[PDB]
Each structure stands twice: as C-alpha cells, then as structure tokens.
Amino acid sequence: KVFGRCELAAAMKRHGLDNYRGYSLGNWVCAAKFESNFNTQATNRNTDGSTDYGILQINSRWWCNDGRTPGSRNLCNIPCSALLSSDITASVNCAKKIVSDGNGMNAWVAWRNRCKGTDVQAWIRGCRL
Ligand SMILES: [Cl-]
Ligand SMILES: [Cl-]
Ligand SMILES: [Cl-]
Ligand code: NA
Known about the structure:
CATH class: Mainly Alpha
Bound molecules: chloride ion, sodium ion
Helix content: 25-40%
Shape: globular
Structural class: mainly alpha
C-alpha cells in the first residue's frame, strides 16, 4: 500500500506513535517518507546481506526473521514479511521496541540525516488528526 501523508499520520496516531518516547508525529511521518516513500512494500538490501522492510525500513539484522540474515536476531518476534502488510500494526509495534532501545530515532539513519532538527510538524500540517 502507498499511504497518503495525512493518511499515514492518522494510522500512526491511532497506533500510539504520536509522542511515543517523546517523538512527535511529524518525526514518524518524516522518517517514513524518507525510508519508504510511504510504501508498505518497500524493501532494501544492506551491504551486510540483511534487508530493510516496510514503511519504516526495519532491519532483519536485529528485528525480524527472514531466514537469510546469518547471525541475526528477531527481537520483534515477527517474520519480516509482516512488515510489508497494508496494515501497519506490526511495523508500529516493532518501531516502538526499536526507538526504546537507547538511541531513540537515531536508529533510523535517514531520520537522523533528513528529519532530525528540521520542521517536522510540516509533515502533519493540514491533516485532520
Ligand atoms: Cl510533529
Ligand atoms: Cl536469519
Ligand atoms: Cl530520545
Ligand atoms: Na533476523
């Protein structure tokens, strides 16, 4: 599924991400924009042979099982395929674990490089929330 901007903001809010670990909704929308372009089916292979999945490009190195990332963990206890669903529940639940692990949203290098410090409220500007 390719979400609209305000559509995704709504679904994130309903799943409890707004202000989760102190990160306003716009942070989460900005990260999804630059990670996936709001496409739940987004995948990207990393140099180490792990893969990033879904709207928030969650990595098989630590967070999900894809059967093809040697030595990896599955800390969200899900198949990585679950992160590709039109329903964002698994991605949001796993993102909450990730952002709680010590580094906040810096886990998402794209958030650090393209969202952190910017006017992230622009990402939810105009949305009925
Ligand atoms: Cl915001
Ligand atoms: Cl594996
Ligand atoms: Cl933090
Ligand atoms: Na894994």
